[PDB]
Amino acid sequence: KAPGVITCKAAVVWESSGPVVLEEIRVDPPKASEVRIKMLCASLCHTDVLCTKGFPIPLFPRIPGHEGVGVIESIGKDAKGLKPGDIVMPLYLGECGQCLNCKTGKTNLCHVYPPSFSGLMNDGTSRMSIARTGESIYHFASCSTWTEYAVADCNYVLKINPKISYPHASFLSCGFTTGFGATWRETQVSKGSSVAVFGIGTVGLGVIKGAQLQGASKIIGVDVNQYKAAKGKVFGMTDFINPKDHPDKSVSELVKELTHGLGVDHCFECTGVPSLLNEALEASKIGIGTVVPIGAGGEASVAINSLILFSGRTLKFTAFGGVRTQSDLPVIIDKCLNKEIQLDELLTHEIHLDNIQEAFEILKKPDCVKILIKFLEH
Amino acid sequence: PGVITCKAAVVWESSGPVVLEEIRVDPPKASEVRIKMLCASLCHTDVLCTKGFPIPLFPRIPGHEGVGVIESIGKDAKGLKPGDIVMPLYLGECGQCLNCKTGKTNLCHVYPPSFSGLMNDGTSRMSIARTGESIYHFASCSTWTEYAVADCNYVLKINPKISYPHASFLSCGFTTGFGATWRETQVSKGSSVAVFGIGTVGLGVIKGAQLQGASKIIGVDVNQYKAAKGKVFGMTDFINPKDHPDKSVSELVKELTHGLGVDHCFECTGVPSLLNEALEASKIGIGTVVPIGAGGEASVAINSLILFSGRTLKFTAFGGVRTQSDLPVIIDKCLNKEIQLDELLTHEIHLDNIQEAFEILKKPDCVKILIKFLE
Numbered sequence: 001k002a003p004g005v006i007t008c009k010a011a012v013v014w015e016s017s018g019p020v021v022l023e024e025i026r027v028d029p030p031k032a033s034e035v036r037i038k039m040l041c042a043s044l045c046h047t048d049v050l051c052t053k054g055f056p057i058p059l060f061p062r063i064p065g066h067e068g069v070g071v072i073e074s075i076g077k078d079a080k081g082l083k084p085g086d087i088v089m090p091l092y093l094g095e096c097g098q099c100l101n102c103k104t105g106k107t108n109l110c111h112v113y114p115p116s117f118s119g120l121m122n123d124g125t126s127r128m129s130i131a132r133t134g135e136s137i138y139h140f141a142s143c144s145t146w147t148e149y150a151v152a153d154c155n156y157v158l159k160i161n162p163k164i165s166y167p168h169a170s171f172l173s174c175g176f177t178t179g180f181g182a183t184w185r186e187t188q189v190s191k192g193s194s195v196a197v198f199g200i201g202t203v204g205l206g207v208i209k210g211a212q213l214q215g216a217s218k219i220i221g222v223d224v225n226q227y228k229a230a231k232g233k234v235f236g237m238t239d240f241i242n243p244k245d246h247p248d249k250s251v252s253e254l255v256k257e258l259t260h261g262l263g264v265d266h267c268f269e270c271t272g273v274p275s276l277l278n279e280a281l282e283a284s285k286i287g288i289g290t291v292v293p294i295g296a297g298g299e300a301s302v303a304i305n306s307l308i309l310f311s312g313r314t315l316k317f318t319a320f321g322g323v324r325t326q327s328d329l330p331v332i333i334d335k336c337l338n339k340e341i342q343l344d345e346l347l348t349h350e351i352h353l354d355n356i357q358e359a360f361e362i363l364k365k366p367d368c369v370k371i372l373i374k375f376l377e378h
Numbered sequence: 379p380g381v382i383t384c385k386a387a388v389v390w391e392s393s394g395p396v397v398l399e400e401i402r403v404d405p406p407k408a409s410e411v412r413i414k415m416l417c418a419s420l421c422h423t424d425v426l427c428t429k430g431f432p433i434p435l436f437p438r439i440p441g442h443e444g445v446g447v448i449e450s451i452g453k454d455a456k457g458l459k460p461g462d463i464v465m466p467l468y469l470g471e472c473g474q475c476l477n478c479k480t481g482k483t484n485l486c487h488v489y490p491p492s493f494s495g496l497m498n499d500g501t502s503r504m505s506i507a508r509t510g511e512s513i514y515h516f517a518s519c520s521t522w523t524e525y526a527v528a529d530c531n532y533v534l535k536i537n538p539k540i541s542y543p544h545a546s547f548l549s550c551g552f553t554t555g556f557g558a559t560w561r562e563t564q565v566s567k568g569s570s571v572a573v574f575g576i577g578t579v580g581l582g583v584i585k586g587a588q589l590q591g592a593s594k595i596i597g598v599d600v601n602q603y604k605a606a607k608g609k610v611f612g613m614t615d616f617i618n619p620k621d622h623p624d625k626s627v628s629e630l631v632k633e634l635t636h637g638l639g640v641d642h643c644f645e646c647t648g649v650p651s652l653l654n655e656a657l658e659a660s661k662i663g664i665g666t667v668v669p670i671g672a673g674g675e676a677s678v679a680i681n682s683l684i685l686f687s688g689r690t691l692k693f694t695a696f697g698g699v700r701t702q703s704d705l706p707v708i709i710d711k712c713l714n715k716e717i718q719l720d721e722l723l724t725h726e727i728h729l730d731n732i733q734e735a736f737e738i739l740k741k742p743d744c745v746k747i748l749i750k751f752l753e
C-alpha cells in the first residue's frame with residue numbers, strides 16, 4: 001500500500017563543460033498532480049549539450065536529457081486521468097486549451113503551462129537526491145530522461161498510443177516533431193513552393209519530410225556532411241548543397257543559384273550556428289521570404305545584417321516548431337502508425353545508459369543522426 | 379522642350395555645407411519626365427545623404443520628399459501629361475512581376491530602389507551652370523531643386539485636389555508608419571499597439587492603429603512635445619522612459635497590458651537598445667514587431683531567448699505601402715479628411731534658407747519642416 005522511495009541509476013553532471021558521471025540516486029514518490037515514470041527510451045540533442053555547458057541557466061548538479069518515453073509507475077492525487085501502465089512522453093510545454101493564447105489557435109506557448117527552467121518542481125523542491133550524500137539534483141526541461149525513474153507534473157506529459165515503437169516515440173519528443181511541425185504551424189509551406197533547410201540533422205530531416213507532404217517543389221538541403229546528404233534524399237529532398245565544395249561562394253548565393261536568383265520561399269535554420277541565420281535570411285525571397293530559426297545557439301545574442309530590416313522578409317521565432325502538445329502532437333504520432341512518415345532511417349547508433357559518457361563523442365561522428373539510450377532491466 | 383537654368387541645394391563634400399548653386403536641367407529623354415517642384419520636406423535620410431550615406435556621392439542635390447507639377451514629358455512615359463501633379467516614389471510597383479502578383483509586398487523586382495545618383499543612362503540631367511560639373515541626384519529623384527528629371531516609373535499620378543504641403547508629407551514618414559498598420563501587420567479591432575518613438579513615423583502608426591480600431595495605442599518617448607502630438611493623432615497611453623529609471627520600456631509596457639504585452643509593436647527609432655525592447659514588449663506567441671526606423675549601424679542584436687518566444691518579426695520598407703496600389707488610397711483618406719495632417723507642419727523655410735533646415739530639425743517642438751520655392 002502507497003508508493004515509496006525509489007533508488008536507481010542516473011546520469012549526473014556537476015560542473016559546466018564537465019564529465020557526466022553515472023550516479024546512484026534517490027527518487028521520491030510523486031506528490032499532488034505529479035506522476036512517476038519508469039524510463040523506456042532516451043535520446044540526445046544539442047540542447048542536452050547546452051545543458052552541460054551552463055546554457056541557458058547553469059544549474060548543477062543536474063540530470064540531463066529531455067527526449068524519451070516511459071511508463072507510469074505511480075501517480076499522486078489529481079493526476080488528470082493518468083493511471084499506472086500508460087505509455088507517456090515528456091512534454092516541453094503543456095496546453096490547457098482555455099488561456100488567451102490557446103484560444104487564438106496561432107501559438108503553442110500556453111500561458112498556464114509554459115516551458116520550465118527552474119530545474120525543480122512547482123514547490124521549489126527536487127524529487128531526486130544523491131543516495132549517498134543527499135544533495136538534491138536539478139532535473140532538466142520538465143522531466144529528465146537520462147534516468148531510470150523520474151517525476152514530472154501531469155500537465156507536462158502526454159499519454160500516447162501503446163502501439164508506437166518506444167524508440168519512435170523518443171524521436172518524436174523533440175527533434176523530428178519540431179522540424180515537421182514548423183512547416184505548417186510557424187510558416188505554412190504551400191503546394192509548389194521553395195524550401196531550403198540549413199543543416200540536415202534530425203531537425204532538418206523533419207522539415208524536409210514536412211515540406212514534401214505539403215507539396216514543395218524545390219527542397220534544398222544545405223549541410224556540411226555528405227553522409228547526411230543521402231538521408232535527406234529519402235525524406236523528399238530535391239537538391240543538395242555543400243558549403244565546402246565552393247569556398248568562394250556563400251551559402252546565401254548558393255541557394256540563389258538553384259532558385260533563379262529569387263531565393264527560396266521558406267528557410268529553416270536548424271544548426272544554431274550564429275553565422276547561418278544571416279545566410280538563411282539572404283537565402284529567402286525578397287519581400288515574401290520567411291525564416292524559421294529552429295536551432296539554438298550557445299551565446300546570449302544573435303546578429304542580423306541591418307539592411308535585412310528593409311528586405312520585407314518574415315522572421316518567425318519558434319518553440320517546439322509550433323506544435324501544440326495536446327492538439328497537434330497526437331496528430332503527428334499517429335502518422336507513424338500509418339507510416340506516412342517513417343523514422344527508421346533516423347536511428348543510426350544505440351547505447352545503454354551505462355555508457356552515456358560515450359554518447360557525447362558519438363554525436364561528434366560524421367555518420368551520426370540519432371542516438372538511442374536503452375535501459376537494461378538489471 | 380529646352381534647357382532650364384534654376385537653383386538647387388547642393389552638397390559638395392561629406393559632412394559639409396549645403397549651398398545654393400545655379401544649375402542647369404537637361405531635357406527628359408525616353409521613359410523620363412521632368413518636374414517643376416512645388417514644395418519640399420526633409421527627414422533623417424537627407425542628413426545621412428550629406429554625410430555620404432548610403433554611398434558617398436558628391437556633388438549631390440539631396441531631398442527626396444516633395445511634390446511638383448509635370449512640365450516636360452518625353453514619350454515612352456506611361457501616359458503622363460504636363461499639368462499633372464506628381465510625387466517622387468522611393469521604389470516602384472511594376473504590376474506584372476512575380477512579387478507584384480503576390481500582393482504581399484511592395485518590393486517589386488523590376489523597379490527597385492536605386493542607389494546610383496544618376497539615371498538609367500548612368501548620366502545625370504543636372505549640372506552646374508558655370509562649371510558644367512555633373513551633379514548626382516538622391517534616391518530616384520532629387521527634391522531640393524526647382525526642377526528635377528526623374529524616371530516616369532518612379533513618380534505617381536496623384537489627385538490634383540490634394541494640398542502640396544500634405545502630398546510631400548505623405549511621400550515618406552507618415553505613410554511608412556500609416557501603411558505599416560495594415561500592409562505589414564494587420565492591426566485588428568480591439569487590439570493593442572505600442573509605438574516606440576513618437577516622431578512622425580510614430581504619428582503615422584498611431585493614426586493608423588486608431589483607424590484600424592486599436593483599443594490601446596501606447597506611445598514611448600522622452601519628449602512631452604511628441605506625447606502631445608501623439609494624443610492629437612489618437613494615442614491612448616504615454617510612457618516616458620525617464621520617469622522610471624529602475625524599470626525598462628518593456629516592463630512599463632507590460633504594466634499597461636495586464637502583464638502580457640501589446641499585439642503590434644512598431645519600432646520607429648532605430649537605436650539598437652529599443653529593438654530588443656520592442657520584441658520584449660510584444661506578446662508571447664501572438665505578438666508581432668515591425669522595425670521601421672534604422673540605426674545606420676552594422677548589425678542588430680537580438681536576445682537568443684527571444685527566438686523561442688514565438689513572436690513575429692516582420693521587416694519592412696516604406697511601410698509595405700505599394701507605390702501604385704496603396705498610396706493613392708492613403709491620399710484619399712487625407713483628401714476625405716479621414717486623416718488630419720495639419721498638426722504635422724511645424725516650421726517653414728525657403729530653398730534659399732536651406733542651411734537652417736538642418737538646425738531646425740533638432741528642435742524638440744519640431745515635427746515636419748516645409749520647404750517652399752519661389753516662382
Ligand SMILES: [Zn+2]
Pocket residue numbers: 044045046047066067174175
Ligand atoms: Zn532535443
Ligand SMILES: [Zn+2]
Pocket residue numbers: 095096097098099100101102109110111112113
Ligand atoms: Zn493554454
Ligand SMILES: [Zn+2]
Pocket residue numbers: 420421422423424442443550551
Ligand atoms: Zn524622408
Ligand SMILES: [Zn+2]
Pocket residue numbers: 471472473474475476477478486487488489
Ligand atoms: Zn513589379
